[PDB]
RNA sequence: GGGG
DNA sequence: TATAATGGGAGTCTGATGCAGG
DNA sequence: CCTGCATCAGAGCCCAAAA
């Protein structure tokens with residue numbers, strides 16, 4: 001598809017809504033000392049440490065493994081009974097040696113770390129607290145990342161939420177004929193629109209507004225006419241109002 | 244040639260327009276409560292601004308001569324509403340806009356029904372115009388929730404209109 | 413279609 | 417008032433005048 | 439400027455005229 005005219009491209013019917021949910025969690029890691037680069041925070045992609053020879057990251061608790069894998073990098077979570085006893089963060093360059101739902105004992109290797117290990121592209125490190133014991137450092141990492149989830153929109157459904165919107169738990173994203181099949185926002189996240197049915201190219205100007213808008217849809221407008229927000233935003237081109 | 248200039252609706256497009264018309268009707272009902280006006284009077288005032296200045300006339304049943312003075316007076320009371328009330332004005336306007344498009348996109352359906360009714364004493368175009376009259380009735384009564392395609396419901400109202408036309412004129 |  | 421239905425069928429010869437065209 | 443060229447409005451009277 002190649003567009004034939006200048007203007008604003010508009011999404012018609014997104015078939016797939018992807019919600020990137022916001023997660024902020026505190027997870028730990030242990031590394032040698034002669035191998036980690038000291039920083040108080042890590043931007044995504046930043047190198048955390050460099051190991052001369054492979055190092056075996058070991059369990060500091062006994063439990064069953066709940067493995068949660070990101071795009072790159074991993075989370076590993078030990079729980080006894082159902083109470084979580086540990087949260088470990090495995091950066092890139094660290095290969096899990098355990099599988100989901102596996103029993104581990106104190107001291108057994110969870111992951112091999114070889115060479116340069118760096119932050120994954122989707123996950124950050126806010127505050128970094130450290131402790132020094134023997135020849136190793138244990139990082140208490142305050143990590144922030146977004147986990148994607150896709151929702152399918154059917155022909156009788158309409159998306160009620162814009163590209164880039166902020167939702168809390170309970171917010172409606174897609175609406176449908178009957179109460180089931182509705183898409184309700186699971187928790188805090190940001191919204192992205194994908195796979196539109198067609199793209200409508202309109203020759204038009206876009207004038208965003210925060211507060212109440214004084215012109216309603218269908219009104220005709222000339223350059224200088226006040227649009228919304230008590231006179232702050234006003235019209236440039238000659239044209240027809242779409243609210 | 245003129246009907247062939249409005250593209251036919253996609254299942255999505257059909258449901259979208261139908262949805263906006265229903266919500267708009269509900270909006271006008273609510274706007275009546277809030278404002279203390281008449282639902283029909285509001286609807287004709289809302290409708291006036293969508294089509295433009297071209298069509299302004301007294302409407303049989305409306306309490307006010309529906310001249311530019313009264314539609315400005317009444318529109319200014321509607322645009323003087325608080326943000327949470329004024330959202331319903333925007334809904335009604337967009338409801339009327341979608342109605343226009345919905346009607347226009349289904350005109351070819353009327354032709355295919357009317358061509359079968361030729362030879363009964365009304366000219367082909369007379370049959371189309373009466374057929375179009377039923378289509379307008381059908382757009383106002385359509386309930387999109389039933390998941391039926393529009394063509395199914397319209398046909399009953401269009402067939403009804405032509406047959407009444409032949410019997411009356 | 414026929415009369416002048 | 418609700419499966420869905422979306423673009424039609426059909427018939428000479430004269431002179432005067434106001435019109436798009438080498 | 440002039441000429442092809444079309445679109446239009448003309449084409450006798452009276453009587454039966456058996457629909």
Ligand SMILES: Nc1nc2c(ncn2[C@@H]2O[C@H](COP(=O)(O)OP(=O)(O)OP(=O)(O)O)[C@@H](O)[C@H]2O)c(=O)[nH]1
Nearest residue numbers: 413414415416430448449450451452453454455456
């Ligand atoms: N205008 C007109 N006159 C007719 C018509 N039919 C018959 N006539 C009359 O028929 C008459 C013909 O008369 P003829 O008998 O031919 O007159 P003629 O010149 O003396 O010819 P001969 O009697 O043979 O010598 C004319 O006077 C006409 O008025 C008609 O249809 N129209």
